[PDB]
């Protein structure tokens, strides 16, 4: 049920007013470990990674109560918030996954140089050179395209068609926050993927 990923996605609706709302968004987020399941126990940082901030973004609203993420890390004002930390981090972890899986479907570059290219223009930074040697020990125990596509969904058109639905509905809360943590001047190292992130959910299928 994979297709269950674009749905969820849908459900996490940015109005007019910019604002991300929080619990659907929390809802999808939980959905994106499909995707890191399918790359198999390589992932594991990035797999600890959204699922710990996920756990402590529910945490750090459990007396604060806010609707939205930008009403969470503003009530907090701080860059050293539970939620601000958390969110940066699952935040980076999505531009990766997002980069990642737009590389996969439009070129046919194999899926190891799909994830180099992805960590390079995000986490990669981030991370000390002792985490970069761990992650690159994890590439190297990356699937081939057609074997993760198949644990996605086990016919590989659908897999990559839902691939490709849910990039689109993931661009648009992605973006919202990614300009929000420049907006907050939080973030400082990870730039993410530049032709995903244009302002159209569909420019980068071309």
């Given at each position: 049920d994979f297709g269950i990923i674009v749905i969820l996605?849908?459900?996490?609706?940015?109005?007019?007013d910019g604002k991300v709302p929080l619990e659907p968004f929390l809802t999808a987020a939980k959905e994106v470990?499909?995707?890191?399941?399918?790359?198999?126990?390589?992932?594991?940082?990035?797999?600890?990674?959204?699922?710990?901030?996920?756990?402590?973004?529910?945490r750090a609203n459990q007396t604060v109560h806010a609707e939205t993420l930008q009403e969470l890390i503003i009530a907090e004002n701080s860059p050293?918030?539970?939620?601000?930390v958390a969110?940066?981090?699952?935040?980076?972890?999505?531009?990766?996954?997002?980069?990642?899986?737009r590389r996969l479907v439009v070129?046919?570059?194999?899926?190891?140089?799909?994830?180099?290219?992805?960590?390079?223009?995000?986490?990669?930074?981030?991370?000390?050179?002792?985490?970069?040697?761990?992650?690159?020990g994890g590439v190297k125990l990356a699937p081939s395209r057609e074997r993760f596509y198949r644990?996605?969904?086990?016919?590989?058109?659908?897999?990559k068609a839902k691939i490709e639905e849910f990039l689109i509905e993931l661009h648009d809360p992605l973006c919202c926050i990614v300009q929000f943590f420049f907006q907050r001047e939080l973030e400082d190292q990870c730039w993410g993927d530049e032709v995903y992130q244009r302002k159209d959910s569909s420019e980068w299928l071309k």
């Open positions: 996605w849908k459900q996490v609706t940015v109005k007019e470990l499909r995707v890191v399941d399918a790359f198999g126990s390589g992932f594991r940082i990035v797999k600890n990674d959204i699922a710990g901030n996920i756990k402590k973004l529910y050293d918030g539970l939620a601000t969110l940066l981090w699952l935040k980076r972890a999505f531009q990766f996954i997002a980069s990642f899986l070129t046919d570059k194999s899926l190891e140089q799909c994830v180099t290219e992805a960590y390079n223009c995000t986490l990669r930074p981030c991370h000390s050179a002792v985490i970069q040697k761990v992650f690159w644990k996605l969904h086990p016919d590989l058109n659908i897999a």
